[PDB]
PDB file of all heavy atoms in Angstrom:
ATOM      1  N   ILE B  66      30.864 -25.012  25.491  1.00 36.88           N
ATOM      2  CA  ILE B  66      32.279 -25.233  25.173  1.00 36.88           C
ATOM      3  C   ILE B  66      33.081 -23.974  25.479  1.00 36.88           C
ATOM      4  O   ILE B  66      33.067 -23.034  24.681  1.00 36.88           O
ATOM      5  CB  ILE B  66      32.476 -25.626  23.699  1.00 36.88           C
ATOM      6  CG1 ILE B  66      31.546 -26.781  23.335  1.00 36.88           C
ATOM      7  CG2 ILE B  66      33.926 -25.980  23.479  1.00 36.88           C
ATOM      8  CD1 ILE B  66      31.624 -27.190  21.913  1.00 36.88           C
ATOM      9  N   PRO B  67      33.761 -23.889  26.618  1.00 34.98           N
ATOM     10  CA  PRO B  67      34.608 -22.724  26.883  1.00 34.98           C
ATOM     11  C   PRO B  67      35.979 -22.895  26.256  1.00 34.98           C
ATOM     12  O   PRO B  67      36.497 -24.005  26.129  1.00 34.98           O
ATOM     13  CB  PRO B  67      34.701 -22.714  28.416  1.00 34.98           C
ATOM     14  CG  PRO B  67      34.712 -24.183  28.736  1.00 34.98           C
ATOM     15  CD  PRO B  67      33.807 -24.850  27.726  1.00 34.98           C
ATOM     16  N   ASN B  68      36.568 -21.768  25.848  1.00 30.68           N
ATOM     17  CA  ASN B  68      37.896 -21.756  25.214  1.00 30.68           C
ATOM     18  C   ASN B  68      38.682 -20.546  25.720  1.00 30.68           C
ATOM     19  O   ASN B  68      38.525 -19.441  25.195  1.00 30.68           O
ATOM     20  CB  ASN B  68      37.798 -21.725  23.699  1.00 30.68           C
ATOM     21  CG  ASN B  68      39.145 -21.949  23.045  1.00 30.68           C
ATOM     22  OD1 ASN B  68      40.164 -21.459  23.517  1.00 30.68           O
ATOM     23  ND2 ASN B  68      39.159 -22.728  21.998  1.00 30.68           N
ATOM     24  N   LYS B  69      39.543 -20.770  26.723  1.00 30.37           N
ATOM     25  CA  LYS B  69      40.298 -19.688  27.365  1.00 30.37           C
ATOM     26  C   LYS B  69      41.294 -19.042  26.413  1.00 30.37           C
ATOM     27  O   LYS B  69      41.579 -17.848  26.537  1.00 30.37           O
ATOM     28  CB  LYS B  69      41.035 -20.219  28.599  1.00 30.37           C
ATOM     29  CG  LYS B  69      40.105 -20.461  29.834  1.00 30.37           C
ATOM     30  CD  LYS B  69      40.850 -20.868  31.110  1.00 30.37           C
ATOM     31  CE  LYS B  69      39.947 -20.787  32.354  1.00 30.37           C
ATOM     32  NZ  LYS B  69      40.716 -20.669  33.623  1.00 30.37           N
ATOM     33  N   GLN B  70      41.793 -19.799  25.445  1.00 29.54           N
ATOM     34  CA  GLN B  70      42.762 -19.265  24.499  1.00 29.54           C
ATOM     35  C   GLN B  70      42.125 -18.189  23.629  1.00 29.54           C
ATOM     36  O   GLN B  70      42.628 -17.061  23.553  1.00 29.54           O
ATOM     37  CB  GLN B  70      43.322 -20.411  23.647  1.00 29.54           C
ATOM     38  CG  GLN B  70      44.660 -20.130  22.973  1.00 29.54           C
ATOM     39  CD  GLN B  70      45.784 -19.857  23.966  1.00 29.54           C
ATOM     40  OE1 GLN B  70      46.301 -20.773  24.609  1.00 29.54           O
ATOM     41  NE2 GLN B  70      46.167 -18.590  24.088  1.00 29.54           N
ATOM     42  N   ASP B  71      41.009 -18.521  22.972  1.00 33.03           N
ATOM     43  CA  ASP B  71      40.252 -17.582  22.145  1.00 33.03           C
ATOM     44  C   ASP B  71      39.363 -16.666  22.960  1.00 33.03           C
ATOM     45  O   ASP B  71      38.727 -15.776  22.387  1.00 33.03           O
ATOM     46  CB  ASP B  71      39.374 -18.333  21.139  1.00 33.03           C
ATOM     47  CG  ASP B  71      40.166 -19.311  20.288  1.00 33.03           C
ATOM     48  OD1 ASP B  71      41.354 -19.036  20.036  1.00 33.03           O
ATOM     49  OD2 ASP B  71      39.606 -20.360  19.895  1.00 33.03           O
ATOM     50  N   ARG B  72      39.299 -16.858  24.274  1.00 32.57           N
ATOM     51  CA  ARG B  72      38.351 -16.155  25.136  1.00 32.57           C
ATOM     52  C   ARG B  72      36.930 -16.233  24.585  1.00 32.57           C
ATOM     53  O   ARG B  72      36.224 -15.228  24.479  1.00 32.57           O
ATOM     54  CB  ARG B  72      38.765 -14.705  25.323  1.00 32.57           C
ATOM     55  CG  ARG B  72      38.467 -14.188  26.715  1.00 32.57           C
ATOM     56  CD  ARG B  72      38.361 -12.686  26.778  1.00 32.57           C
ATOM     57  NE  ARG B  72      39.601 -12.013  26.457  1.00 32.57           N
ATOM     58  CZ  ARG B  72      39.674 -10.790  25.943  1.00 32.57           C
ATOM     59  NH1 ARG B  72      38.573 -10.088  25.663  1.00 32.57           N
ATOM     60  NH2 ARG B  72      40.856 -10.274  25.693  1.00 32.57           N
ATOM     61  N   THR B  73      36.488 -17.449  24.274  1.00 32.96           N
ATOM     62  CA  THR B  73      35.132 -17.655  23.773  1.00 32.96           C
ATOM     63  C   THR B  73      34.382 -18.674  24.622  1.00 32.96           C
ATOM     64  O   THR B  73      34.968 -19.629  25.164  1.00 32.96           O
ATOM     65  CB  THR B  73      35.132 -18.128  22.320  1.00 32.96           C
ATOM     66  OG1 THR B  73      35.816 -19.393  22.228  1.00 32.96           O
ATOM     67  CG2 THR B  73      35.809 -17.104  21.446  1.00 32.96           C
ATOM     68  N   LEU B  74      33.069 -18.464  24.708  1.00 31.10           N
ATOM     69  CA  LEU B  74      32.136 -19.450  25.204  1.00 31.10           C
ATOM     70  C   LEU B  74      31.153 -19.781  24.094  1.00 31.10           C
ATOM     71  O   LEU B  74      30.428 -18.899  23.615  1.00 31.10           O
ATOM     72  CB  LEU B  74      31.407 -18.944  26.444  1.00 31.10           C
ATOM     73  CG  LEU B  74      30.332 -19.890  26.952  1.00 31.10           C
ATOM     74  CD1 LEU B  74      31.003 -21.219  27.484  1.00 31.10           C
ATOM     75  CD2 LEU B  74      29.473 -19.202  28.024  1.00 31.10           C
ATOM     76  N   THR B  75      31.133 -21.048  23.675  1.00 31.97           N
ATOM     77  CA  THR B  75      30.257 -21.464  22.591  1.00 31.97           C
ATOM     78  C   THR B  75      29.090 -22.292  23.104  1.00 31.97           C
ATOM     79  O   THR B  75      29.282 -23.221  23.889  1.00 31.97           O
ATOM     80  CB  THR B  75      31.049 -22.217  21.523  1.00 31.97           C
ATOM     81  OG1 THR B  75      32.099 -21.379  21.054  1.00 31.97           O
ATOM     82  CG2 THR B  75      30.148 -22.529  20.377  1.00 31.97           C
ATOM     83  N   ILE B  76      27.866 -21.915  22.709  1.00 31.10           N
ATOM     84  CA  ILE B  76      26.655 -22.686  22.987  1.00 31.10           C
ATOM     85  C   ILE B  76      26.192 -23.315  21.677  1.00 31.10           C
ATOM     86  O   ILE B  76      25.810 -22.586  20.738  1.00 31.10           O
ATOM     87  CB  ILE B  76      25.527 -21.845  23.581  1.00 31.10           C
ATOM     88  CG1 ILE B  76      25.974 -21.210  24.914  1.00 31.10           C
ATOM     89  CG2 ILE B  76      24.276 -22.710  23.851  1.00 31.10           C
ATOM     90  CD1 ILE B  76      26.838 -19.979  24.702  1.00 31.10           C
ATOM     91  N   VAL B  77      26.202 -24.653  21.629  1.00 33.22           N
ATOM     92  CA  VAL B  77      25.831 -25.421  20.432  1.00 33.22           C
ATOM     93  C   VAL B  77      24.535 -26.154  20.705  1.00 33.22           C
ATOM     94  O   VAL B  77      24.411 -26.845  21.727  1.00 33.22           O
ATOM     95  CB  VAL B  77      26.887 -26.467  20.007  1.00 33.22           C
ATOM     96  CG1 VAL B  77      26.558 -27.024  18.605  1.00 33.22           C
ATOM     97  CG2 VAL B  77      28.299 -25.955  19.993  1.00 33.22           C
ATOM     98  N   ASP B  78      23.607 -26.106  19.754  1.00 31.94           N
ATOM     99  CA  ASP B  78      22.475 -27.024  19.778  1.00 31.94           C
ATOM    100  C   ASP B  78      22.266 -27.624  18.398  1.00 31.94           C
ATOM    101  O   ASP B  78      22.789 -27.127  17.395  1.00 31.94           O
ATOM    102  CB  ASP B  78      21.179 -26.359  20.251  1.00 31.94           C
ATOM    103  CG  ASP B  78      20.696 -25.273  19.321  1.00 31.94           C
ATOM    104  OD1 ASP B  78      20.226 -25.593  18.218  1.00 31.94           O
ATOM    105  OD2 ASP B  78      20.776 -24.086  19.702  1.00 31.94           O
ATOM    106  N   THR B  79      21.506 -28.721  18.391  1.00 30.83           N
ATOM    107  CA  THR B  79      21.093 -29.438  17.197  1.00 30.83           C
ATOM    108  C   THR B  79      19.600 -29.255  16.978  1.00 30.83           C
ATOM    109  O   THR B  79      18.888 -30.159  16.529  1.00 30.83           O
ATOM    110  CB  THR B  79      21.466 -30.905  17.310  1.00 30.83           C
ATOM    111  OG1 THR B  79      21.002 -31.377  18.570  1.00 30.83           O
ATOM    112  CG2 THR B  79      22.971 -31.074  17.243  1.00 30.83           C
ATOM    113  N   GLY B  80      19.131 -28.036  17.231  1.00 29.73           N
ATOM    114  CA  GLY B  80      17.737 -27.702  17.021  1.00 29.73           C
ATOM    115  C   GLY B  80      17.438 -27.522  15.535  1.00 29.73           C
ATOM    116  O   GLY B  80      18.242 -27.836  14.663  1.00 29.73           O
ATOM    117  N   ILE B  81      16.268 -26.932  15.264  1.00 29.11           N
ATOM    118  CA  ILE B  81      15.809 -26.770  13.885  1.00 29.11           C
ATOM    119  C   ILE B  81      16.654 -25.805  13.037  1.00 29.11           C
ATOM    120  O   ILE B  81      16.584 -25.868  11.804  1.00 29.11           O
ATOM    121  CB  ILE B  81      14.319 -26.372  13.902  1.00 29.11           C
ATOM    122  CG1 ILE B  81      13.710 -26.642  12.528  1.00 29.11           C
ATOM    123  CG2 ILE B  81      14.156 -24.921  14.310  1.00 29.11           C
ATOM    124  CD1 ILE B  81      12.251 -26.345  12.407  1.00 29.11           C
ATOM    125  N   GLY B  82      17.498 -24.940  13.617  1.00 30.09           N
ATOM    126  CA  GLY B  82      18.290 -24.029  12.801  1.00 30.09           C
ATOM    127  C   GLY B  82      17.488 -22.837  12.299  1.00 30.09           C
ATOM    128  O   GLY B  82      16.295 -22.671  12.570  1.00 30.09           O
ATOM    129  N   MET B  83      18.167 -21.991  11.534  1.00 29.89           N
ATOM    130  CA  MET B  83      17.572 -20.742  11.061  1.00 29.89           C
ATOM    131  C   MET B  83      17.904 -20.545   9.590  1.00 29.89           C
ATOM    132  O   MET B  83      19.022 -20.827   9.152  1.00 29.89           O
ATOM    133  CB  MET B  83      18.054 -19.548  11.876  1.00 29.89           C
ATOM    134  CG  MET B  83      17.502 -19.499  13.297  1.00 29.89           C
ATOM    135  SD  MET B  83      18.204 -18.150  14.269  1.00 29.89           S
ATOM    136  CE  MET B  83      19.805 -18.809  14.544  1.00 29.89           C
ATOM    137  N   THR B  84      16.908 -20.070   8.834  1.00 27.23           N
ATOM    138  CA  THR B  84      17.109 -19.743   7.439  1.00 27.23           C
ATOM    139  C   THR B  84      17.737 -18.351   7.310  1.00 27.23           C
ATOM    140  O   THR B  84      17.761 -17.546   8.252  1.00 27.23           O
ATOM    141  CB  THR B  84      15.786 -19.781   6.690  1.00 27.23           C
ATOM    142  OG1 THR B  84      14.965 -18.702   7.169  1.00 27.23           O
ATOM    143  CG2 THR B  84      15.066 -21.103   6.929  1.00 27.23           C
ATOM    144  N   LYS B  85      18.245 -18.061   6.117  1.00 28.56           N
ATOM    145  CA  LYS B  85      18.753 -16.716   5.875  1.00 28.56           C
ATOM    146  C   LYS B  85      17.679 -15.686   6.202  1.00 28.56           C
ATOM    147  O   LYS B  85      17.957 -14.675   6.843  1.00 28.56           O
ATOM    148  CB  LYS B  85      19.227 -16.565   4.425  1.00 28.56           C
ATOM    149  CG  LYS B  85      20.031 -15.268   4.151  1.00 28.56           C
ATOM    150  CD  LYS B  85      20.471 -15.159   2.679  1.00 28.56           C
ATOM    151  CE  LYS B  85      21.642 -14.202   2.486  1.00 28.56           C
ATOM    152  NZ  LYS B  85      22.292 -14.398   1.149  1.00 28.56           N
ATOM    153  N   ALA B  86      16.440 -15.950   5.792  1.00 32.69           N
ATOM    154  CA  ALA B  86      15.345 -15.015   6.044  1.00 32.69           C
ATOM    155  C   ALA B  86      15.134 -14.778   7.537  1.00 32.69           C
ATOM    156  O   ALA B  86      14.836 -13.649   7.964  1.00 32.69           O
ATOM    157  CB  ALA B  86      14.063 -15.542   5.395  1.00 32.69           C
ATOM    158  N   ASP B  87      15.254 -15.827   8.343  1.00 34.43           N
ATOM    159  CA  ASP B  87      15.199 -15.642   9.791  1.00 34.43           C
ATOM    160  C   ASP B  87      16.254 -14.645  10.261  1.00 34.43           C
ATOM    161  O   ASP B  87      15.940 -13.655  10.943  1.00 34.43           O
ATOM    162  CB  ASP B  87      15.362 -16.987  10.479  1.00 34.43           C
ATOM    163  CG  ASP B  87      14.152 -17.888  10.273  1.00 34.43           C
ATOM    164  OD1 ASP B  87      13.033 -17.350  10.093  1.00 34.43           O
ATOM    165  OD2 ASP B  87      14.320 -19.126  10.284  1.00 34.43           O
ATOM    166  N   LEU B  88      17.512 -14.877   9.891  1.00 31.84           N
ATOM    167  CA  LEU B  88      18.588 -14.005  10.354  1.00 31.84           C
ATOM    168  C   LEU B  88      18.393 -12.563   9.908  1.00 31.84           C
ATOM    169  O   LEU B  88      18.548 -11.633  10.706  1.00 31.84           O
ATOM    170  CB  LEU B  88      19.907 -14.509   9.824  1.00 31.84           C
ATOM    171  CG  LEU B  88      20.272 -15.905  10.291  1.00 31.84           C
ATOM    172  CD1 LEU B  88      21.465 -16.368   9.470  1.00 31.84           C
ATOM    173  CD2 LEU B  88      20.587 -15.899  11.750  1.00 31.84           C
ATOM    174  N   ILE B  89      18.153 -12.350   8.612  1.00 33.66           N
ATOM    175  CA  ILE B  89      18.131 -10.981   8.098  1.00 33.66           C
ATOM    176  C   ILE B  89      16.846 -10.260   8.498  1.00 33.66           C
ATOM    177  O   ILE B  89      16.887  -9.141   9.021  1.00 33.66           O
ATOM    178  CB  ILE B  89      18.333 -10.962   6.573  1.00 33.66           C
ATOM    179  CG1 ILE B  89      19.733 -11.461   6.228  1.00 33.66           C
ATOM    180  CG2 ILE B  89      18.194  -9.537   6.051  1.00 33.66           C
ATOM    181  CD1 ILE B  89      19.988 -11.593   4.734  1.00 33.66           C
TER     182      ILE B  89
END
Side-chain angles (χ1 to χ4, degrees):
Chain B
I66 309 177
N68 190 321
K69 284 185 167 202
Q70 201 62 75
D71 306 329
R72 216 202 296 153
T73 61
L74 175 66
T75 303
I76 300 79
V77 191
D78 64 71
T79 50
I81 198 178
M83 289 175 286
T84 68
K85 191 181 201 164
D87 290 332
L88 299 169
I89 294 175

